[PDB]
């Protein structure tokens, strides 16, 4: 469960949040493959409630109605097509598995679902599965409301309803089997692994019992004996009786401390500066690198949900965001996931984004295709961060330096830092309010290197800054504090 199962030389997953399957399939072929992306996390591919008040929010996808592969992202033929086409060019698909629960208990019975399946929350009836009242934790939960009231009580966090979401009885073999049946459907199609939604809300042992029933990965694409990559969503910033480490048996876990801390550092909030990153990783109290799934922002916390609060950096704070993502992708700690977002009409009112619920760009609820502009950005309000040159090139920097040790660290005692990854790459950051102008040891072979942040290597030349490493490995760097991207990255494959 710990191996990503990406092709060799590919080291990151991108969350193509709310994208349609036909658009992901094409994106695999025209961009993700040639740019060395390891894989794609997809939005939940199983039928959900169509919530019309408010109008088709992103979070309707976290309220299952069945395990039919029938969503606003597309139907089962399209899902299958996407997975095949992506695997065929060496790009993996990881599914957002929503397995803790079905829909909200107070949602109306009917066929308001992405595939038209009938369901009845009040009578606990999901006949497209099928599930009935026997399959939920109503009699196990010991709270008065039946919902989770107190996170200091680990038992109720598992057995009671998360904000009224009907809590599946994952202690029962029948439920475990229906869920395993769904995941095996996906595995056999070609899926390489899963993001396990709401993992904190499930017993580690129950997740174990589900994983036990799963196939090895599809043997046309994966070496026989391959197990799905598993990364479990657990928000653990400390102080709770439930801990990220409690889930290590099943796979990797999301390290939400990562982006929260990094956001604070890059904003220079709370007395924090980049020189303190010399011991980034377990030195900052994070989980082991070999279990961490790390990220600057995710789909929840980029809009003030889950955890991290105000320190979280997003495409909205583009300049600082690029630096944060670049530091992530250069640093050996964790397995890296890059967000890819859509622009929504963000509007604050006494501190809240009242449009934090808004779903993807749409025409009367039909998700818009992803168009690609002339300059290779996206239209139709798709932000496509993974296509920003500064991010895309840092995704390849992580590939090129894969396995190399953190070395040649430099800092000025403030916010001017640099470090290398063995002899394959070097990166330099200026987050101070004055210029960074200094000759530094890079660890690299002598040569002329393109800066992959300001530009690209194209057949014998560079479209941006050029860095000149001398025979002793030293090279001069000059980054103004008013630079739009106040960092520079070079590596073995950016060398002329
Ligand atoms: Ca639960
Ligand atoms: Cl997540």
What one-character DSSP code corresponds to residue 6? P
What secondary structure letter does DSSP report for 349? E
Shared-domain flag, residues 79 and 57 = yes
Give me the numbers of helices (H) and strands (E) for the chain, helices first please.
8, 24
Enter the tokens of residue 423: 């002899």
**Domain hosting residue 357, numbered range:** 2-403
Residue 312 and residue 349 share a domain: yes
Task: Give the H or E element holding residue 389.
Answer: helix 389-400
Which residues is 458 bridged to in the sheet?
A: 461
Q: Are residues 338 and 236 in the same domain?
A: yes
Query: What is the chain's Cα-based Rg?
Result: 23
Which experimental approach was used here? X-ray
Distance 237 CA to ligand 1 centre (A): 20
Please state, in angstroms and rounded to a whole number, the distance separating the CA atoms of residues 210 and 395: 33
Given a contact cutoff of 8 angstroms between Cβ atoms, the answer to whether 236 and 270 are in contact is no
Spatial distance between the Cα atoms of 195 and 193, rounded to a whole number of angstroms: 7
Interatomic CA distance for residues 440 and 428, integer angstroms: 9
384 backbone dihedrals φ, ψ, rounded to 5° = 50, 55
Is the domain of 239 the same as that of 103?
Answer: yes
Together in a domain, 447 and 471: yes
Binding site as annotated, residues for chloride: 195, 298, 337
Distance CA(156)–CA(144), nearest Å, equals 11
Binding residues: 100, 158, 167, 195, 201, 298, 337
Same domain, 202 and 134: yes
Which of 403, 436, 468 lies at the terminal end of a domain, its last residue?
403
CB 164 within 8 A of CB 106: yes
Return d(Cα 311, Cα 305) in angstroms, integer.
12
> Which tokens hold the place of 152?
């200091």
Report how many domains make up the chain. 2
- Please indicate, yes or no, whether residues 349 and 365 belong to a single structural domain of this protein: yes
Q: How far is the CA of 280 from the centre of ligand 2 (A)?
A: 21
- Least distant ligand from the CA of 297: 2
Dig out the tokens for 28 from the structure. Answer: 């695999």
The secondary element (H helix, E strand) that includes residue 205 is helix 204-211
Q: Which of 356, 378, 403 is the last residue of a domain?
A: 403
Centroid of ligand 2 to alpha carbon of 197 (angstroms):
7
Nearest to 111 by CA among 158, 66, 58: 66
Final residue of a domain: which of 361, 384, 403? Answer: 403
Residues 454 and 333 in one domain: no
Q: Are residues 32 and 133 in the same domain?
A: yes
Q: Which residue has the tokens 């990166």?
A: 427
CATH number assigned to the domain comprising residue 26: 3.20.20.80
The catalytic site residues sit at 197, 233
The contacts found for 472-476 with CB under 8 angstroms, 24 or more apart, are 472/441, 473/441, 473/442, 473/443, 473/444, 473/445, 473/446, 474/439, 474/440, 474/441, 474/442, 475/426, 475/439, 475/440, 475/442, 475/444, 475/449, 476/437, 476/438, 476/439, 476/440
Residue of 302, 329, 299, 50 whose CA lies nearest to 197: 299
Same domain, 67 and 122: yes
Which residue, among 38, 113, 114, has the nearest Cα to 73 in the 3D structure?
A: 114
Pair (397, 413) in one structural domain: no
Specify the resolution in Å: 2.1
- 209-to-104, 180, 206, 290 alpha-carbon distances in Å: 25, 9, 5, 23
**Could you tell me the CATH number of the domain that includes residue 435?**
2.60.40.1180
Q: Are residues 412 and 469 in the same domain?
A: yes
């Amino acid at each position: 469960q710990y191996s990503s199962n990406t092709q060799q030389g590919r080291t990151s997953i991108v969350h193509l949040f709310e994208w349609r399957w036909v658009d992901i399939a094409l994106e695999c072929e025209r961009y993700l493959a040639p740019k060395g992306f390891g894989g794609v996390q997809v939005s939940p591919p199983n039928e959900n409630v169509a919530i019309h008040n408010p109008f088709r929010p992103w979070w309707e996808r976290y309220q299952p109605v069945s395990y039919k592969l029938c969503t606003r992202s597309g139907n089962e033929d399209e899902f299958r097509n996407m997975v095949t086409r992506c695997n065929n060019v060496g790009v993996r698909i990881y599914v957002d598995a929503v397995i803790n629960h079905m829909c909200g208990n107070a949602v109306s019975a009917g066929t308001s679902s992405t595939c038209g399946s009938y369901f009845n929350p009040g009578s606990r009836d999901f006949p497209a599965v099928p599930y009935s009242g026997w399959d939920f934790n109503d009699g196990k939960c010991k709270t008065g409301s039946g919902d989770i009231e107190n996170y200091n009580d680990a038992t109720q966090v598992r057995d009671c309803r998360l904000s009224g979401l009907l809590d599946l009885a994952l202690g029962k073999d029948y439920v475990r089997s229906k869920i395993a049946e769904y995941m095996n459907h996906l595995i056999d199609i070609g899926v390489a692994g899963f993001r396990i939604d709401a993992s904190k809300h499930m017993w580690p042992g129950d997740i174990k019992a589900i994983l036990d029933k799963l196939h090895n990965l599809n043997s046309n694409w994966f070496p026989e004996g391959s197990k799905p990559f598993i990364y479990q969503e657990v928000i653990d910033l400390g102080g709770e009786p439930i801990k990220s480490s409690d889930y290590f048996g099943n796979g990797r876990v999301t390290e939400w401390k990562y982006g929260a801390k990094l956001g604070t550092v890059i904003r220079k909030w709370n007395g924090e500066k980049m020189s303190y990153l010399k011991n980034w990783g377990e030195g900052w109290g994070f989980m082991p690198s070999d279990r961490a799934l790390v990220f600057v922002d995710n789909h929840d916390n980029q809009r003030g949900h889950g955890a991290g609060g105000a320190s979280i950096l997003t495409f909205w704070d583009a300049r600082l965001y690029k630096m944060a993502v670049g530091f992530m992708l250069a640093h050996p700690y964790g397995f890296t996931r890059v967000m890819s977002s859509y622009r929504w009409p963000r509007y604050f009112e006494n501190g809240k984004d009242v449009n934090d619920w808004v779903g993807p760009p749409n025409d009367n609820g039909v998700t818009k295709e992803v168009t690609i502009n002339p300059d290779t950005t996206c239209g139709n309000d798709w932000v496509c961060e993974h296509r920003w040159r500064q991010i895309r090139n840092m995704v390849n920097f992580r590939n090129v330096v894969d396995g190399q040790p953190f070395t040649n660290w430099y800092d000025n005692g403030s916010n001017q830092v640099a470090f290398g990854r063995g002899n394959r790459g070097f990166i330099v950051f200026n987050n101070d309010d004055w210029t960074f102008s200094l000759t530094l040891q890079t660890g690299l072979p002598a040569g002329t290197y393109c800066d992959v942040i300001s530009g690209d290597k194209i057949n014998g030349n560079c479209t941006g800054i050029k860095i000149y490493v001398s025979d002793d490995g030293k090279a001069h760097f000059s980054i103004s504090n008013s630079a739009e991207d106040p960092f520079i990255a070079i590596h073995a494959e950016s060398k002329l």
